[PDB]
């Protein structure tokens, strides 16, 4: 029956060729520099970001997409589609989600179904892949697709570490956590999402130990022998990510592994040297 489009914001970091394969449209968030503000992924790739930042001593900030651009995308989309699955980074770390919702009453020709992925990066990307796959196999209810995504959210996991805690501190997305701890985070932990916001998952002494702990955490799901997607995400640490994927994929042939990155908007908050691993059931 009805035609359903799929949208995600840039911070899902789905490779552009893969988005084309799967019919996934994308709305960029912004990275703000001293002179220029860019639309990430389209106007600034991840290597340029980390290169620009260190060779200009940039202290970038980020912005959600202008509500105007969301509306324009939906209006355009609505000429060929009845509904859009609009998938976004956590409502606890960005106003993007709530702008997608508010943009729905601003467009007549399409029904927007905002989905709070309560996460970001390729973990959020995974929801858009599932949505496209469902749509490809004749999913004709936007509601049924959303139900599907919410169930999948039950088993999506992500753990990550940063090199310098200062970037997160600066961007403000450790506020909730620190509001609950009652004080200031000084030592680097494993981080994860809990109730839509970033919080320490566990105290750890070294990055090496953090990775090994995350391996254990992955094994808990990877050991069931059920089909999975997983991504090792880096902020300018591609070789390190590749060694991890080399070792992990050998160990888990049933887990499809992606080498992915923190782009300009997310890397603005995590900082170069950040590393994480996420996964979910296919």
Ligand X SMILES: CCCCCCCCCCCCCCCC(=O)O
We find the least distance from the C-beta atom of residue 139 to ligand X, in angstroms, to be 26
Residues contributing to the annotated binding site for hexadecanoate: 62, 94
Q: How far is the CB of 40 from ligand X (least distance, A)?
A: 10
Return the axis-axis angle of helices 142-152 and 121-136, rounded to nearest 10°. 140
The 10 Å CB-count burial string (b at 16+, else e) for 58-93 is eebbbebbeeebbbebbeebbeebbbbbbbbbbbbb
Residue that has been written with the tokens 């030592």 in this structure: 187
Q: Is 120 in the site for ligand X (CB under 6 A)?
A: yes
Q: How far is the CB of 90 from ligand X (least distance, A)?
A: 8
Contacts made by residues 210-217, CB under 8 angstroms, sequence distance 24+? 210/159, 210/161, 211/161, 211/244, 211/275, 213/159, 214/159, 214/190, 214/277, 215/248, 217/157, 217/159
In whole angstroms, what is the distance from residue 154 CA to residue 197 CA? 16
Identify which range of 45-53, 109-117, 222-230, 270-278 contacts Br ion by CB under 5 A: 109-117
Q: Toward ligand X, which CB reaches closer, 26 or 83?
A: 26
Region class of 5: left (phi > 0), else alpha (psi between -120 and 50), else beta? beta
Using CB under 6 A as the binding rule, the residues of this chain from 185 to 204 that contact ligand X are: 198
Q: Does the footprint of Br ion cover residue 109 (CB under 5 A)?
A: yes
CB atoms within 10 A of CB 257: 19
Considering only 14, 87, 210, 233, the residue that binds ligand X (CB under 6 A) is: 233
Q: Which is nearer to ligand X, 83 or 266 (CB)?
A: 266
CB neighbour list of residue 169: distance below 8 Å, 6 or more residues apart: 185
Report in angstroms how near the CB of residue 75 gets to ligand X at its nearest.
22
- Residue of 149, 158, 162, 244 interacting with ligand X (CB under 6 A): 158
Least Å from the CB of residue 30 to ligand X? 8
Residues that bind ligand X (CB under 6 A): 29, 62-64, 93-96, 119-121, 123, 158, 160, 173, 198, 233, 265-266, 269-270, 276-278
Residues that bind Br ion (CB under 5 A): 16, 41-42, 78, 104, 107, 109, 134, 139, 144, 161, 164-165, 173, 175-176, 188, 197, 207, 210
């Amino acid at each position: 029956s009805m035609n359903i489009a799929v949208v995600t914001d840039s911070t899902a970091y789905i490779p552009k060729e893969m988005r084309e394969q799967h019919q996934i449209h994308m709305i960029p968030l912004q990275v703000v520099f001293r002179e220029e503000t860019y639309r990430e992924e389209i106007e600034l790739d991840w290597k340029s970001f980390y290169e620009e930042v260190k060779k200009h001593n940039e202290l970038p900030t980020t912005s959600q997409p202008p509500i105007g651009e969301l509306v324009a995308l939906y209006e355009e989309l609505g000429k060929s589609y009845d509904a859009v699955i609009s998938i976004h980074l956590s409502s606890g770390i960005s106003g993007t989600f709530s702008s997608a919702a508010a943009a729905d009453s601003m467009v007549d020709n399409i029904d927007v179904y905002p989905f709070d992925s309560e996460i970001s990066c390729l973990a959020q990307g995974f929801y858009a892949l599932k949505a496209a796959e469902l749509i490809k196999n004749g999913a004709s209810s936007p509601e049924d697709i959303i139900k599907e995504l919410e169930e999948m959210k039950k088993t999506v996991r992500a753990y990550f570490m940063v090199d310098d805690l200062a970037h997160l501190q600066r961007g403000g997305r450790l506020s909730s956590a620190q509001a609950f701890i009652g004080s200031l985070l000084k030592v680097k932990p494993i981080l994860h999402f809990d109730n839509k916001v970033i919080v320490p998952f566990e105290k750890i002494r070294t990055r090496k130990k953090a990775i090994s702990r995350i391996y254990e955490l992955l094994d808990e799901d990877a050991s069931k022998g059920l089909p999975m997607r997983a991504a090792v995400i880096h902020a300018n640490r591609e070789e390190e990510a590749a060694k991890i994927i080399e070792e992990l994929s050998a160990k888990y042939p049933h887990v499809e592994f992606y080498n992915s990155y923190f782009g300009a908007v997310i890397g603005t908050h995590l900082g170069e040297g950040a590393l994480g691993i996420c996964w979910c059931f296919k």
